[PDB]
Each structure stands twice: as structure tokens, then as C-alpha cells.
Write a protein that binds this ligand. Sequence first.
Ligand SMILES: [Mg+2]
Lengths: 49, 49, 1341, 50
Amino acid sequence: AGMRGLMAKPDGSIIETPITANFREGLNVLQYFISTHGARKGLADTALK
Amino acid sequence: VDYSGRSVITVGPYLRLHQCGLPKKMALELFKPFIYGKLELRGLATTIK
Amino acid sequence: VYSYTEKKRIRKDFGKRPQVLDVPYLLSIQLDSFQKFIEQDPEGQYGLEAAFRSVFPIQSYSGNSELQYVSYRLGEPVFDVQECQIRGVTYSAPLRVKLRLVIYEREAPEGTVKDIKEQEVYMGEIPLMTDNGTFVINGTERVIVSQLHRSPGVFFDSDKGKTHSSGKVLYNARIIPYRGSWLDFEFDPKDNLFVRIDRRRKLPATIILRALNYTTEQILDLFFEKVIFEIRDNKLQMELVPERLRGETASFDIEANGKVYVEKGRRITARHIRQLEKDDVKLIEVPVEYIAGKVVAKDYIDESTGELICAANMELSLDLLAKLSQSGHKRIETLFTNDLDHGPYISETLRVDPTNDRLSALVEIYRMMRPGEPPTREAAESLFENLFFSEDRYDLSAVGRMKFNRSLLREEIEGSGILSKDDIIDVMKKLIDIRNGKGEVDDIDHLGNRRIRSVGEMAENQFRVGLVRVERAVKERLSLGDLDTLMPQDMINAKPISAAVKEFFGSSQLSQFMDQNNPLSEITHKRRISALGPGGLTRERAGFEVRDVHPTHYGRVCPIETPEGPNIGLINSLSVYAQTNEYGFLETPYRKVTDGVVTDEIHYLSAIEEGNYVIAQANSNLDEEGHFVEDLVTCRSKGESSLFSRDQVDYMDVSTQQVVSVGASLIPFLEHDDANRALMGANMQRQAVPTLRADKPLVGTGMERAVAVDSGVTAVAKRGGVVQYVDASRIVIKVNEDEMYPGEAGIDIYNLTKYTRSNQNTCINQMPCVSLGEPVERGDVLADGPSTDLGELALGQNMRVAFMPWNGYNFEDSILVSERVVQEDRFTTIHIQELACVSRDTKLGPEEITADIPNVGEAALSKLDESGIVYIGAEVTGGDILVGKVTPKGETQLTPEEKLLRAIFGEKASDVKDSSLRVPNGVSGTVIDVQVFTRDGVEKDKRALEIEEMQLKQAKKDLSEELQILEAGLFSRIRAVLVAGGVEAEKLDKLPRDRWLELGLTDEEKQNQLEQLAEQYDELKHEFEKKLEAKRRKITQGDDLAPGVLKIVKVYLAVKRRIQPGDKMAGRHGNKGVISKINPIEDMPYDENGTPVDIVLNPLGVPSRMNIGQILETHLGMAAKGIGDKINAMLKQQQEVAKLREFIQRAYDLGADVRQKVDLSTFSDEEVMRLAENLRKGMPIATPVFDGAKEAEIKELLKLGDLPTSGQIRLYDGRTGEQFERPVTVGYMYMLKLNHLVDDKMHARSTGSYSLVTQQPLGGKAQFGGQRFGEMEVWALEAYGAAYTLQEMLTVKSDDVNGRTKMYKNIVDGNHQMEPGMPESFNVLLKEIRSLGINIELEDE
Amino acid sequence: KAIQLHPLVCAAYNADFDGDQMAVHVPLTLEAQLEARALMMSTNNILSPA
DNA sequence: GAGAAGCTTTTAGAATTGTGA
DNA sequence: TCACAATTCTAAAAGCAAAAAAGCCTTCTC
Ligand SMILES: [Mg+2]
């Protein structure tokens, strides 16, 4: 419902611009790309821990 | 090990929590020597073959 | 306008952005590469020409002998792709090379040759590539996967923090050649350039400079500045370059030109620098202490004594200043060291250098490389001058030279693939520059540093390996000079080249078994990029920076399509519009944005050009004539997104779906799914198995047509025409006059592919979708492959869903299906097995395949025929006999009396062991095909003759039919040409159809065309006869088999599998599940209209697994099916076309300003009813990926129908008739049936066979086997008090042989007790340890 | 063809029903049957040992 | 043909030697 | 002498299961 907030890039540096859109509305291409950074990081972490 | 099998698990909400559902096929495949014992006991088959 | 295959069913297309670029042909990555491999290329850049012209001509060892290349040719394959898939061989072309051999004369190394000698040569076959992009290597279809690897060139890494645990940063520079040896320049914790060649012993750098003939004076001249010291009045007033002392703190006074500039203990600030510039301070008074700590640069010798004063590069002292002052040397040149910018790195390395001269350097290099033997001068110089400086053992490619010269800023983009003095010295200077602070380090994840190999490149590399092996062989065979003989065909050995190319294509890491149970699976296997393979990294050696999404992946690699598990992040997939440079780097298309207006010229940008521009976003609003409507836009400039003014953007994206792959662009409402579930649903859409009946999605993305047409499953009309004839197996198309060649009247014949077998044992089957007498244009689907529906891709079925709990039967991820789903066979699938019975040449006599099996009655022989093979169409079950085979087990004589029984049978000494082929247990099916391969020189049995005669009749009928229909068309065209020009219609049929050129017509171009068609007919006759004769030849030919084998009988069973509790059942949004109950129809929830719901899911899967896309898909599917229900209501209560066209127009014309305009005033009222019939199942809807529909549009489409806008209706309990409270979300969702079937996962065993070395059960369902009781289960049993369970599982159920036999005998005798024993694996271990010197023994009791 | 597992014991196994498999073993001797009935029965394992 | 004769992980611990006092 | 410390050599890196394919020394005959 609310915005999904701020996402960190692979280096851990928090990206300045947040994702102000939420999943009820649509993310656009750039916001989704950042979300993919985060998701791939998480999946790799689990699969290799 | 012998006397072991696999299969996919589903949910049975009617069981009491000390129970599981075993397919008839797997049950017959895992319990063959016991069935031979009972068959020869009842006399339904004289020799093992 | 609408192509006729598209007028039958239009997809309601939301999405508002115009599509400036069509989606390209999806298989270009494979086809273009392999085309560049095998082509005749003048000027010789790519492929076989490149390899040959690179390795040839041959120059003998001063033997006046050479082999010259001329040209090459590819013959035609002996078999076709299908006849090769059946016979189990490779689909390949012979390679015929025109070679010459010319030999010179003595004392004539350049004059005219004595003789020339020329003919063909056969260096083996090369596998060809099918028109789809696949190969056939042993009858099986295979795919060679593209490879992302490190680009050749120079890379400046960091290795920043972990080393030395001190916070100091090392630097290194590596050189990657395409082929050759590596070369490092790596720092140390103490700031000294070391070098290593292929990661051997780390070693001081300067050696190689000394190996390259550089005296120390030259080295210091190259790597350092010079500072002047002149003997003068006193104290050697130093000649200062004005900017040298910038930033340096002063330590004394500086006076020159009668002006004092700087006081001691004060740095030269900006004001001091300006003063120095203004005063032209050149010669300054300085003490001698300044020269105390400098370094002599150029070697200084003594002149009066004729001796040496000081050596180059050693620290000076004041006594040496006095000594050289009195020697005559008046000018002194020192090196401008520093502590801010110019460190003494090279100088310190020279200090650490032990050697003195190039001989010592090369000896040290030789010892480092090949340690153990005595260095010698010639060996050392040869080793060094072949390490990096030879065409044979080192090559920077064209891409390598480009990247090299681009890293060092040199302007040239072409050159030599060989390192040089200038190149290495430039690398050293650049690396030192990075150290000093002026420069940065490469990131190895950048897609500009990574390059793609495709089939052509790898195949050419392996062919080059084979060629150089043949080169050495021919070199040796020709060095032993024999001339006027030895045609250039005998010294040539095809075995190495064939072995190398076959090793690549058949057994390689990147040449893998084709994934084939879905058109999407095939197409996304062909567009797959892998960072693994020969020359790449590995699964366990992969870090996390390579497992990750870099910002330059945008538009080139998909972020959300990669396999989970171990090799995540290394098996990436290539985006829809991604492409490749001439050099092998990924590029993606953008639109130029000039002067604010956004034009439509497409530039293809690579990652190292994307960083120099500001690229706008695909969904940034455009107004009329192409301005940015709002005055500032979101872009990305330097690997980072941010918001920019309007007149700064240089490019725009081509579409909103260029960032994703083709698997992830068929998930509607992707932007409403969390990336993890998008990944799972993208990967999980490829495991879907084709269904008995294909069913389109109601909610799609419009990408279905492209995916189905661009794969080789449908049958697409090559040339537009009129459907002459249709059949389940054939389609004949009469071509149109506008589209026809001068001669060759011709007709397009498409033979469809009926129930044959795929790599995953599924069924591929083509169904005609056209009907007789129908127009077809080019690019029109005529037959529907598997998982296709009128051209559209159709992977599953669109079921009716309700999201609610139901008595715990969809508890965690289970699914509750109704019986109406199984009665309608909506998820029934066909699977084709294959079973081979191979009769071998065994000792004591070969097997026979007769039907006279011993120790079986006639009940199991009721199915086999006379020859001992089952009948086609026979409904076999598990345990039956498919082929009756018997092995001879040797003569036997139990007792003399028993012979009488053998005499009674009439067996007459035959005692054979039964070894027949039996149906593997539990698989009911029908025998749909049988094949028999027989070795040359064995007698074909009755059924072999029957099969051969049948297929001979089929071949003759097929060729007769094709020639008959072609000549029918040819004579029809002849008559059509006879429409005018003296036509005698009454005399047209006075004679049979053959001789129509003798009628009365003028002798003009019309008669020339008549003769053209007649000669075409004659050539058709000749080609028919030749083809028929050849097919008769090869059909009777006995196939080539393995060694020591007589004949192979292959049976095919066609099983039909229906869904059952335990089958996996997914959707497109990553929502898996296992069917847990097949419910009766009257038990399911139903609505006020009495309609039951087909499937029931759990709402609890939505919040935690944030995939909101499935609820939106459910709502939009409900809306679409409502439109279809109204259309059905109209089309049933028979109406007139006015109301239907008005309503369908109302449906096709709602939303925001959307691309497509469908106007039904042009549909001619006859195909409006056809369209309505196709729409009575629900109007299909296209919802593009990131510019899809909106909830307002969904609500409007719901309100068009008579559905509630909330999406939730009122349901009633199926078995209590009671209204559920809380209106529930029902709608239509596209369900897939994944290929994880419970009847393939179940397995059980009481007893069976055991391994040899360790008498344990075998492992696997394939070879009937037991379950592993691993060590974690052992621990879990130890954590209970379960000691007896553990003992029995360790001894009597795995290893203890006598114990387990006794346990069996006890169980069958109603006694439950075990004899412990000691495992046999432990005895095996004891022997394995005693086979060393160790003596491990069990002590006494 | 699938094993029906009680809903409550799924937390102990960490098992959902989206494709997981399970292996089943038979205790033969009499003491192993007593151990299964007394030490390992699912009605004894209601508390965690952690 | 059948049968021989003969060119990249990362971390961490433990053993050398290589100056350094 | 007798002590730190840079080199370098050695070990380790989850479990369970399904399917498929390719193989099981060189070479030297005459
Ligand atoms: Mg699971």
C-alpha cells in the first residue's frame, strides 16, 4: 500500500531516489531494475549460505 | 537402505496427528515380506514362489 | 488493414505508447553466427576461409616444398534431418578443399616451380545447423550455448583491502590475450613492481625491460624526469623547472635574480607559484644537502684515471660529489623523485633486481618458467621471443587490439596481435600512473569488458586446433622429401579435424542437450548466455560481484530470468532487442533525441558508449510531433538514475519491454509482482508441458504471436496463395500469379509432423488450422505446433478460480481441483516413451528374437506376432512382453531322466534363457511405432520385410503424389496461359492432359513460356525418377550399428496422463502448488447463477509473496470472460450482425488513448460472425509489460459486461447451501501443468540388487534402488534414543549380507529379530587401508 | 500416489506443499517398532529441544 | 583386422628463511 | 646468537532426488 522506500545498490550505497510507487500501482522500468538488484542479492545470499 | 521409498507430499486435514496417508502401491511394495508371512500363515499360498 | 490470420481473432490491446520498432527475429544470435562460420568470404575475415588462410600455405623446413590453399566447398548431406534423426547419425556436410602442391628446384628458391599438382581433399564432415538454430549430433537435437567471457586486452584491477591487512591498496595490471600466455604487473606491500607470466613465481618487473635490451640509463630516461645540477661559483645553484616544487614544503631559502622568494619551513602556495612564474625563476641558490638524497641517473665514468666514478642508480654522497667534481664531470642529471606524485617505484625495483645483464635476465626467466634443467643461451632467447612475440603462440585478436589501444588512449583501432616494446612500456607507465593517483581502475563486471562467443567463433577455434595438428603432421610427413609422388591427399589425415570438431559438438560443456517440451523452452534455450564453460569461470569459484545485476545490464541482459540454485547469476538470458557488435559486445537500440523533438532513427549503442549520453526513459510522455510534454524527465547518465532538464537528453528507449527477456515478457502485470516471484514464474513457464487441447490465454501481453512464429514449431506460409488442399498430414497451397517465378508453376506443399517424440519424451504434433479454399498471405501460420492456438502461444488452460480457504485442502500451497476439470480432459497430456531391445553377439551363440519363449504360456504371447514383436496399436501394460528375445546359456544336462521331458517337448536340445524386452512396470500405453535396424549381412525377419515393404510403398506413393499434384498445377497454369492466343476449348480436351504444346497457338513469347513449362515437366519427371531410385536404395540399406550387435528393435509407447493428487500446477506469477484433492462438482463453491468454480486457491499466498499480478489477472480475466459470455448470449439467441458488430465495436473501443483502432465497418459482415464465434469463449486481451492496463480500465471493462466492479461476487457452500460471508474474488486465471508428475516421483523398494564392491542397495528409480540414509538422518536418530532402529538400518538393511538374508527368512517366518553382524563396507575399508603400509587390526575379544 | 501429511507437523519438517518430496522407511525388528512408537512418535514431539 | 607391449576463490593454519638486533 | 615476518604449501568449502548423454590407454602391424 505505501511506498516501498529506499533500495541499496550492490555496493551497499543507498540509492538517493526512492521507489515511491507501491505494488498496487505499477513500478516503472527504472524502479523495477533497482528492485531486481535487491532481489538477486537476496537470492544469491541464501543459495550460498 | 532397503524397505524405503519416496513420493510427493500432499495435505490431509482429516488425519489425527499420529497418522499419515500411505499410498496402497507404496504400502504393498514396502511390506512384501510381511505379506508373504501372513499368506503362508493363512495357508493361502504354500510355497514362497 | 489486418492480415487474414489476424482478422479471425483480434486481441484487445491496452497500452498507450506507440511501438517504433518491431520485435526482431529472435534466433538471429545463432543463425547469423553459424552463417558467418560457413560461407565463402572474399578477403577472408570469418570462418573456414579465415582458418585456412591463417594456417596455410605451408613452408617446409627449407625443402623447396609447399602446400597452397585455393578454395573450399561444402557438399550436400547424405541424409535429411528427419531421416538422420531416425537413423541415429549426425546431420553434417562433407568438406571438400581444392589443394595444390608446388615444389621448387635446387638453386631456385623464387624461380618458376618445376611442377604443380592439384586436386580435392576431404578433411572430414562439419555438422550443419537446422533452419531453427539446432544441430543433430547422434540423432538427438542439441544446442551450443553462447558464452560471456572476459574480453581480450589490458585490465587494471585493484585487489584493494584484503591483502596485507594494513589498509594499504595494491594495484595490478593484467593482459588477457585471446590465445597465448598471460602477463601481470602487480605491486607489493612495499611498492615494487613485480611480474608473473601465467601465475608462476612472482618476480621483479624490470627484468623484462632488461630482457628487451634496455640499459638502466634508458629505463630511467623512460620512467622519470630529469633535474639539472651545474657546478658553479659554489653549492651548485640548481636549475629549477618552475612547477617541480609545487606542493613541496620548503626547507631553506630561495634567492635568485636579486629577489628572495621562499623562506624555510613554508610551502610554495598558489601565491608563491605565481611569484615563481612571474619572476622566471630558473637558476636558484641551494645548499649541497639537496644533492645528498638525490639519485644519479646516467652512468658516470672517470676520464683521467680511465676508471669508473659511480654506477647509475645509486644514492649519492658528498664525497662522491667531490670525486666527480675533480673528475671533470660538470653536469649532473638526477631523477625527480617525490612523495606526492612521482614515487621511486622503478628505482626501488631496480635496487631489488639481482641480475645485471640480459643473459642473466633470460636465464632467470627460463629457470622460473621451466625449472630443473641447465639454462642455455639459445633456449632462453627462443623461450622469451616465443612467449609473447610470435604469431604461433600468442595472439591479441582484433577485439583485443581495440580494447588494448582504447585502454592506453592510443588513437589507432587496428594493428598487430603481437605485444611489442612500446605496448609493454605503455602498460607499465599507465599502471604507475594509476598508482600515483591520476587514473582509475576497471570494473570487471562492466558489460563493456565482457564479450560474447557464439557457435561460429567456438567452432572456428576448434577447427583451427585441428588444422594446426594436421599442420604438424604434414610438416613431418613432407620433411622426409619424396617428390613427383605423394598426391596432396595421403599426408592429409582427416582423423584429427573430425575428432576435434566432434569433440566440440558432441561432448562439450556449452554444447548441451536441447530443452524441448515447449516452444518457449526451446527459444529461451537458444537465447541463453552463460558465464561458464571452457575459458570461463566456475560455479563454486564464482564470487558475488559476478553473481549480480550490474547497471549496464539495462536492455542487454534480463535481470529477472536466471535459474535459481547453484548457478544463479551465471546463466543470464538475452533481452528482446539486444544484439551484438562486429566485435562481440552487446548493444541495444535507442532513438535519437535531437533539438527536443524525438526522431525515429535507431542507433545501436554499446555499454562503453551508453555512459557518454543521457538516455531518457521509455515511458516518458510524448505529445504530438514528438516533444517531451513536461519540462524535465527522468534519465540515467553515468550508471545512475536521476532527473534532468528537457534539453540535456541525447537518446530515448525504444520500448518499455527492451529491459526484459522473452520469457519474462509473457507475464501480464509484471510490474505488480515482486522480483523473486517474477523470477520464479519466468523460469517456471518453461517447465509447462503441452496439453491435449491448446487453449489461448484470455490475458496475454501481445508477445505470444512473435514467440510462436519465430520458433520452428508452426508451419508458416512461405508464399501467399490459396489453400488448394488440407489434410491432417498435408497442406497444398496454390501460389498467386504476382508471387510466382517465370517458370515452375509449382505449389507449396507442407508436410506436417504427426505424433513424434521430443527430447523430454513429450509429444509434438502439428494440427492444420486453415480450411479448404481459403486465402493465405506470407507469414501466416498454417499448422499449429504443440502449445499453439491459431498462431498464438498457449502453454496451459484458463481455469475459473476462487481465492478462499476451503476446509484446509489448500492449506499451505495445495490446490483443490474439481472433477469437472478432469472429466473435460483439460490437463491430459501425451507422453511417448522409447524402448530398445538390442540383440548382441554374445559368447556361446547370438540371441534370437523368435516368439518361442520358454517358461511362459500363450497368455503373454497373445500380443506378439509370428516374428516375436508386438503389434502396432497393441494396448500393452506393465510387465507385458514387447519383443521376445532369448539368450543361449550353454548346454546343460540335469539328469538322464529329465532328457525325456526335453524329448517330450520336442525342444531338441535348445535350452535358452529368457531375456525378452518387457514394458517397465506401471506404464499403460499403446504401441504407436516400431522400428527395426539390422546389421548388413543378417537375415531380415518377416516383420522386417513387412516394415520395409510398407515404407517402400509409402515412399513410392509420396513421390507419385508430389509429382502428380505438381504436374496438375503445371498443366493448370499451361491452360491458364492458353486463356488467349488461339485457344481451342473444344479441342483442349480432345487429347489427354500431356501433350498441349501441339495445339494451335502462335510462335511468340507465349510459346516460349509453353516450352519453358514443358521442359519443367520433363525435369520434374527426371528428378522424380532419380529421387525414387535413391530412396529405394537407402531404404533397403542395412544400417550401421555398434560393434558386436546384430539388430535393434525400437518400440514406442504412447501414454496418456491425467492430473491426479500430487501433480504440480503453477501459474505465470510464481504461484506454485500441488493438487491435493480432486473434488466432486457438487462439493465446490458456486455462485447465484449455479456455476461452480473449477479451482480454489489460498489468499494467504498473496501478502507474504507479494505477487499482486495474479489478482489483477484474475479480475481482468473475469472481465474478458464476461464480454465473451455476452457475445455467446447474443450468438445463441440468434441475432443479426448489426447488434453483434455494435457491441464488439463498443468492446474494442474503450480505454484511454490506446494504440490500436479496430473498426468493424471494413469486416464485410461475414467474418464478423466468424470473429464473434472465436470471441464466444472470452475476448483475448493484450496487456504489455510495463505499459499495461489500469484498474480504471479494468473497472470499465467489468462495467461493459454486467459484472460487479469490485471483482468479488457472492458464493454459496457446495455441500451446505450456505452463503459464505465476505464476498470472494473469483475470476479466470491461466494455469500451467509443470512436468513434475507424481507418478514419476513415487518409488518404493523392499529388496533388489546390490553393488559389487560394497554390498549396498543400488541408487535410483531407473535401476530399482533404495533411499540414502545420510549422515544428517544418522544424527537425528542419535538425538533420539533410537539405537536399535539405527543398528538395523546400518547393518541388516544395507550391508550385513548374512544378517539381511537371515532377517528376510525371519520375517517370512513371523519372527521379528535380527542377527547383528558387522558391515561389509567396513571390511572393504580395512582392506583398503591394509593395502597401504598401515596395519589396522581388530583387537581380541 | 502422494503421501498425505498432517498440517500441524509441517512446521517441524519445514515443509510446504509446492513440490516437496518425502522418504518413508519401515522399521523391521521389534525393538525398532517400540522405539518408533515410544521415542519418535509424532505425539511425543510437541515441544522443541532447542 | 584383432592382439598384444609398454593460464582466476577465498580463508586460515603451519612450516621455511630472510632479514633484523 | 634468536625473533618477527613475508613466503608458500597444505587443507576445506550442505543435503536429497529426477532426466539425459559420452566414456572406459597408444600404437603397430602386414
Ligand atoms: Mg517447498
